[PDB]
């Protein structure tokens, strides 16, 4: 019961700024700390610049409303599974056996909520040693036609299937901030998260949802080498996490 | 009025060589598809990016030990990726298509193909993003995991869709008596029914052939809907088969 569930945030494994370009080098290191770090995991990644671009130029978000919106939603699929396929590639690189599991291609979405109703397929490449990784991706939705699922909500999923000892979210920054660190440079780190959010991004919602039953939730820089790595043995590091 | 069509990795792949793509075939085959102006929902076989890796480590015998797991996800990769490069020339053609892995969904049972959510695929092809599944590795339920082929696919969609016509597309003018590679005095098989299939059972056929061909295209049919056997490696053959003149090819019938 000692499983970490991760997250490899789109904000590092593709440059966002840039539409379909995937950063081979930092992903080839990430999935090398993840190997030499030892411990069992089932990786997660987002979308990054392999959707997002085209989504919000065709609103794919928010719902089927016009019919020029299919071939746009079929090219983001299609992308985010190519993308996903060079994660994949890098983990057999490592020795990690791993399969996409595109939840457009499988599952449905109902009022922003990733249903799994089939958990056969996904438990059973568990038990084979077959990483199953989702990803962000266009998903059927029972009401609007199609939706977007994010990556954080397919970890929501598995963290409930599997119940991991601990949840890491993997992106370009130190932590959580006062505000974005790229913009202000009056931005503090936040070191713990717990239920004083009542205080207010809304990064703590999403961190303190994986909370459950006594997990801790850690969100960490993949641009700074070894610190998953360090992180994954235990070692302290510079990182935000959420608690209770 | 929707057209089943198998894209046979002996078209779509250089099955001779691993991990080889027959990208202008396939955007030949796409732009065919499109010009016949047919409502068609497209399965694909993986071929060398499945077969070669599968034959080294008997992935067909299923989970038998540990150094299988490593070469069912690289396979499992192979086939997500050949199927990006088949919809990458769907989406070329203006027709849009999405992948589903079998692997990643469905699971098998007694070398039979277990759909128990049709809801999302379903919902794909009512909003005209194409469901294309593939050859591919996929869980077993009994034997850890299996080995599901492009013609299993279609029995599923052809069972899911009802198809009025479903077509195979491969590297042959149709079905011989014998393999046409291995043996030049062997004719073409024009119409294939139950009656033929019962007749090319023999203890060769046990012992394995042309007789599970033959069942492949049979299972595809039914009391009016045919199924047709086409080379893709003639231009224009596919073509004119979706338009629904006569061509080259072996033609099932009648169910069994
Ligand atoms: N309060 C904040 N603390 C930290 N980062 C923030 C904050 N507000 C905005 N950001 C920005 O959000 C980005 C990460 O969010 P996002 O890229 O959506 O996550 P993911 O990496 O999972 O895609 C960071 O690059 C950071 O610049
Ligand atoms: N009786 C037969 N008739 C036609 N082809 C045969 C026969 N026996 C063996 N073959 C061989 O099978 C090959 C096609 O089979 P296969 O690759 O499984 O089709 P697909 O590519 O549609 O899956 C042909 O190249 C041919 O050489
Ligand atoms: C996939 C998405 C969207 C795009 N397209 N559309 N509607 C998102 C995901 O999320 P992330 O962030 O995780 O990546
Ligand atoms: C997946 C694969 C591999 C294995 N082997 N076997 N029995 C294949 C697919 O299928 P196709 O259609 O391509 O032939």
Same mark, same amino acid.
């Given at each position: 019961?000692?499983?970490?569930?991760?997250?490899?945030? %789109?904000?590092?494994?593709?440059?966002?700024?840039?539409?379909?370009?995937?950063?081979?080098?930092?992903?080839?290191?990430?999935?090398?700390?993840?190997?030499?770090? %030892?411990?069992?995991?089932? /990786?997660?990644?987002? *979308?990054?610049?392999?959707?997002?671009?085209?989504?919000?130029?065709?609103?794919?978000?928010?719902?089927?409303?016009?019919?020029?919106?299919?071939? *746009?939603?079929?090219?983001?699929?299609?992308?985010?599974?190519?993308?996903?396929?060079?994660? /994949?590639?890098?983990?057999?690189?490592?020795?990690?056996?791993?399969?996409?599991?595109?939840?457009?291609?499988?599952?449905?979405?109902?009022?922003?909520?990733?249903?799994?109703?089939?958990?056969?397929?996904?438990?059973?490449?568990?038990?084979?040693?077959?990483?199953?990784?989702?990803?962000?991706?266009?998903?059927?939705?029972?009401?609007?036609?199609?939706?977007?699922?994010?990556?954080?909500?397919?970890?929501? /999923?598995?963290?409930?299937?599997?119940?991991?000892?601990?949840?890491?979210?993997?992106?370009?920054?130190? %932590?959580?901030?006062?505000?974005?660190?790229?913009?202000?440079?009056?931005?503090?780190?936040?070191?713990?998260?717990?239920?004083?959010?009542?205080?207010?991004?809304?990064?703590?919602?999403?961190?303190?949802?994986?909370?459950?039953?006594?997990?801790?939730?850690?969100? /960490?820089?993949?641009?700074?080498?070894?610190?998953?790595?360090?992180?994954?043995?235990?070692?302290?590091?510079?990182?935000?996490?959420?608690?209770?």
């Amino acid at each position: 019961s000692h499983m970490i569930l991760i997250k490899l945030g %789109g904000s590092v494994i593709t440059d966002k700024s840039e539409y379909h370009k995937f950063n081979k080098e930092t992903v080839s290191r990430l999935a090398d700390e993840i190997r030499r770090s %030892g411990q069992d995991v089932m /990786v997660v990644h987002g *979308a990054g610049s392999f959707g997002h671009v085209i989504a919000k130029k065709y609103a794919i978000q928010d719902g089927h409303v016009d019919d020029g919106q299919i071939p *746009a939603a079929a090219r983001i699929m299609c992308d985010t599974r190519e993308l996903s396929s060079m994660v /994949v590639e890098e983990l057999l690189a490592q020795g990690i056996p791993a399969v996409s599991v595109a939840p457009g291609s499988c599952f449905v979405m109902e009022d922003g909520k990733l249903i799994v109703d089939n958990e056969e397929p996904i438990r059973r490449l568990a038990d084979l040693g077959i990483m199953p990784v989702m990803f962000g991706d266009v998903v059927p939705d029972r009401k609007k036609g199609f939706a977007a699922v994010s990556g954080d909500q397919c970890m929501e /999923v598995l963290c409930r299937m599997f119940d991991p000892e601990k949840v890491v979210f993997v992106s370009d920054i130190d %932590g959580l901030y006062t505000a974005d660190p790229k913009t202000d440079k009056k931005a503090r780190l936040i070191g713990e998260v717990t239920r004083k959010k009542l205080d207010e991004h809304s990064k703590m919602e999403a961190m303190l949802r994986m909370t459950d039953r006594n997990r801790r939730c850690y969100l /960490v820089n993949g641009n700074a080498p070894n610190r998953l790595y360090s992180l994954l043995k235990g070692e302290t590091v510079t990182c935000t996490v959420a608690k209770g």
